[PDB]
Amino acid sequence: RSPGVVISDDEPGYDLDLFAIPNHYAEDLERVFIPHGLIMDRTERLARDVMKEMGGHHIVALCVLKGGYKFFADLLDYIKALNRNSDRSIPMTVDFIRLKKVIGGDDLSTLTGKNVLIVEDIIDTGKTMQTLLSLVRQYNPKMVKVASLLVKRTPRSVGYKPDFVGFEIPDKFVVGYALDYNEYFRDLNHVAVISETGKAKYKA
Amino acid sequence: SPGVVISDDEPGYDLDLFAIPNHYAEDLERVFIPHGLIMDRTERLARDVMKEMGGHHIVALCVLKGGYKFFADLLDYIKALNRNSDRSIPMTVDFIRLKGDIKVIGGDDLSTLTGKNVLIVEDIIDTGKTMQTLLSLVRQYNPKMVKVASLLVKRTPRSVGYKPDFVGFEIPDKFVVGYALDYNEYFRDLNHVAVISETGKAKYKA
Amino acid sequence: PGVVISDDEPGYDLDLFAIPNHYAEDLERVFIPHGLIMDRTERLARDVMKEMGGHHIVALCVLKGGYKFFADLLDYIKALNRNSDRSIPMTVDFIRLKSYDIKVIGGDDLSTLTGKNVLIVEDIIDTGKTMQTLLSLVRQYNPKMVKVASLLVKRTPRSVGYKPDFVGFEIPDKFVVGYALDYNEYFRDLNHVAVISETGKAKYKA
Amino acid sequence: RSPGVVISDDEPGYDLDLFAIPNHYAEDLERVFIPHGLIMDRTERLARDVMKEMGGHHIVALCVLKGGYKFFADLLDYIKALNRNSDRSIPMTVDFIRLKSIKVIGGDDLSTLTGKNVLIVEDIIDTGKTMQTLLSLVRQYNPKMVKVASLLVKRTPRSVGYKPDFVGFEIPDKFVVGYALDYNEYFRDLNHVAVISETGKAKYKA
Ligand SMILES: Nc1nc2c(ncn2[C@@H]2C[C@@H](COCCP(=O)(O)O)N(C(=O)CCP(=O)(O)O)C2)c(=O)[nH]1
Ligand SMILES: Nc1nc2c(ncn2[C@@H]2C[C@@H](COCCP(=O)(O)O)N(C(=O)CCP(=O)(O)O)C2)c(=O)[nH]1
Ligand SMILES: Nc1nc2c(ncn2[C@@H]2C[C@@H](COCCP(=O)(O)O)N(C(=O)CCP(=O)(O)O)C2)c(=O)[nH]1
Ligand SMILES: Nc1nc2c(ncn2[C@@H]2C[C@@H](COCCP(=O)(O)O)N(C(=O)CCP(=O)(O)O)C2)c(=O)[nH]1
Ligand SMILES: [Mg+2]
Ligand SMILES: [Mg+2]
Ligand SMILES: [Mg+2]
Ligand SMILES: [Mg+2]
Ligand SMILES: [Mg+2]
Ligand SMILES: [Mg+2]
Ligand SMILES: [Mg+2]
Ligand SMILES: [Mg+2]
């Protein structure tokens, strides 16, 4: 199916001075990699693709924190827009989980017999998603799909690819739009690349 | 300031004046606080948060699940301030569920709060007992400061008298849903704050 | 009939909202918050598409007061049309009404309206005289249909009885500014609709 | 100064199936050239640049219809957002004009521009001859300053040498539509900037 918006390995990105950038990170980012408004435009379209394939039965939206919170909130807002401007709509429930083994959610028995949409910020090797999916399938959901904002082109991939992708990106470390570098850079609406100064100041 | 005061005799708006998810058509009586009104109030709240807390690294604490919309929209408005001004501060986020010492579920170690400007984000304050006990727990990790932003505060004689630092709307003692406030997990997928209908209370009764 | 706002409606305190500093002392109350304007306009866009979405739409913006409603109304119409399975193209036009009965300045040859679904977008209907007259001028070129969306309709004893087809809000006979509604060319740069204070009315009096 | 966002001559664009596109233009478009969200992000930064240079005196924002209305609306929305989330801000008035094949159609009296800070807002500069002509008329009325913002500037050898003060994007010498930019009045109702396809150039040709 669709592999998303392909960002080539040689993408230059954009000069920071062409966009509005948080003052505290000005010296800490290299380039803007994916502008926030382009994330919205892509997400809008994924929202329609999601409803096409899953609007026929109750959806349980499952946000993988922390990185996924922003993508999850905006994906859901566009899905909500679809549901209030059209005759066809089905209820949605939401839940949140963090991965260490699953940390702090509803009991997974809520997923049984439901359309489960797992929402992720990034897929790298895909090992984590494979592991979460084999766990979720033990609870017998009607169906389980994975929406991920980014998929990284990496040789370390184990072969997993999600059902809805936003962008496919080089094997580069990106921050922003809730993706972090040691907890920092979540408070940034663009996806960006850290500068050298940057990763020093916030090294662990 | 108690925020935007909605009075006990406010009728709210007929469902037909607004766009409503069709599957909740029968289950809501009135729209209580339209989404765009929530946005406008949150915009102001974002400015008051930065004026008081912008001096030092903020840790924003979302109280799941009901707080997640208010949290994302408040942080969105704070982000918009920080990329359009000459002074801002880094801000990290964490998410927690709450169930005597209050049981905090998930979350980083609370030592991550030591010495930070901590902001707790809540969907609604009712008796105040939950924030009072969470505050009592957080102060023991020695934050620089700790403050609470709540979209909604209920006027109730059952209040233990706790007032949060930032409040969107002060509302009557009525059960409201929407904007991530649920009735048995339903109605989170609704952008307006609304009052639950009678058919809908029975239809979704646990 | 649209969102009805009553005579004794208080409005909202300026300090609960974000307000441009240069107008802080010039307004008495926020009358209709921006975000509430948007919520109603989303719904109106759906009515428009249902009634006129079957044939080419020509949307006519009545400058200057209409430009803000017009832009937002059309943006919610575009949002429907890239998320439906059957949409229709729309073209746009802009006009100003000058006396000496009504002169249509700017805008295309009215022959372009023949056979089209014509939507006239207006900021406020006061007496209804302007709209009645423009309608009679447009019906002369034989549009497939002509409809009026007005953001505001005033309640008045001096109304000549014209009623638009789509109404945002029905309001008292107060003097409101904001959201592109002006006083002596001022207050167009303000997202909320507000009532003008006495200080402000003197400060900008022509 | 900022030459704006430089879109190369070889830029491939994006496939239409990766974005939400109006149904009725499905076949009429080749690629998305500049997504609506990119335009927004860039405009947000032009609003800060505009304010930093013109924000010390009453601004008259002059929208050149019809192509400029979208960019005008969004630029002024980002400017308003700055003015209500900072301590100090300056008032702003708006006028609209249309050009005919040299002749300024509509608009207030050009004397309303004397001593003002005039911001002319344009969708596209190509040769620049029209902007030079417009400036030559505005300058007869002695503005305090006059500046031009253009969403798009074409890299063309046919350029007469004129450069605007604020530029969103520097684009190839090729024909784009959307975001109010039209082809025989069509494609204005589209939020992305895009390249017309063959079916489309033929379907709406003059
Ligand atoms: N910011 C950023 N993170 C990247 C990037 N590449 C890989 N990662 C990892 C990806 C994710 C989890 O890994 C599963 C992937 P897998 O498919 O390989 O198993 N991480 C977490 O820290 C989770 C905790 P959170 O932050 O959500 O609280 C960092 C990148 O380019 N940028
Ligand atoms: N939807 C809605 N809930 C209301 C309303 N009144 C009171 N509540 C409570 C508020 C909260 C508990 O907090 C007590 C705070 P208190 O200590 O100050 O009394 N609840 C939860 O279910 C938390 C789990 P969540 O849903 O977040 O996952 C229900 C109302 O009108 N509407
Ligand atoms: N701001 C504001 N104006 C009000 C209010 N009440 C009445 N008006 C009038 C209404 C409008 C003309 O409309 C008459 C339609 P009528 O024939 O039905 O009475 N005006 C214009 O100045 C048009 C030129 P513009 O401003 O678009 O360039 C002012 C109010 O409360 N607030
Ligand atoms: N859509 C689109 N138009 C382009 C493109 N290249 C040039 N044009 C022209 C540009 C403009 C006039 O401006 C002259 C600029 P110049 O003097 O600097 O050479 N036009 C109008 O039709 C104005 C009436 P409007 O439609 O606004 O009411 C079309 C392009 O790529 N796409
Ligand atoms: Mg993740
Ligand atoms: Mg991480
Ligand atoms: Mg709560
Ligand atoms: Mg609850
Ligand atoms: Mg008018
Ligand atoms: Mg007027
Ligand atoms: Mg032009
Ligand atoms: Mg043209």
Author numbering:
A (entry chain A): 3 to 102, 114 to 217
B (entry chain C): 4 to 102, 111 to 217
C (entry chain D): 5 to 104, 112 to 217
D (entry chain B): 3 to 103, 113 to 217
Pull verbatim passages from the article behind this deposition.
The key enzyme in the salvage pathway is hypoxanthine–guanine–(xanthine) phosphoribosyltransferase (HG(X)PRT)4. Inhibition of hypoxanthine–guanine–xanthine phosphoribosyltransferase activity decreases the pool of 6-oxo and 6-amino purine nucleoside monophosphates required for DNA and RNA synthesis, resulting in a reduction in cell growth. Five compounds synthesized here that contain a purine base covalently linked by a prolinol group to one or two phosphonate groups have Ki values ranging from 3 nM to >10 μM, depending on the structure of the inhibitor and the biological origin of the enzyme. X-ray crystal structures show that, on binding, these prolinol-containing inhibitors stimulated the movement of active site loops in the enzyme.
For the human enzyme, the l-prolinol and (R)-isomer configuration is the preferred configuration (i.e., 5). Key to this preference is the parallel π stacking of the purine base with the conserved aromatic amino acid in the enzyme (i.e., F186 in human HGPRT) and the fact that the 5′-phosphate pocket can expand to bind the 5′-phosphonate of 5. The phosphonate group of 5 does push further into this pocket than the phosphonate group of 1 or GMP, forcing the flexible loop (D137-T141) to move away. The movement of this loop triggers a further structural change, and this is between residues P168–V171. This loop also moves outward by approximately 1.7 Å. In human HGPRT, it is the phosphonate group attached to the carbon atom of the prolinol ring that enters the 5′-phosphate binding pocket whereas, when 5 is bound to TBrHGPRT1, it is the group that is attached to the nitrogen atom. In the human HGPRT·5 complex, the phosphonyl and carbonyl oxygens are coordinated to a magnesium ion and this sets up a network of bonds which firmly anchors this inhibitor in place. Superimposition of this complex onto that of the human enzyme in complex with the transition-state analogue, (1S)-1-(9-deazaguanyl-9-yl)-1,4-dideoxy-1,4-imino-d-ribitol 5-phosphate (ImmGP) together with pyrophosphate, shows that the phosphorus atom, the phosphonyl oxygens, and the carbonyl oxygen atoms of the inhibitor are located in a similar position as pyrophosphate. These interactions may be one of the most important features of this ligand that contribute to the nanomolar Ki values for human HGPRT (3 nM). The tail of the linker finds itself in a location that strongly mimics the location where pyrophosphate binds in the human ImmGP.PPi complex.
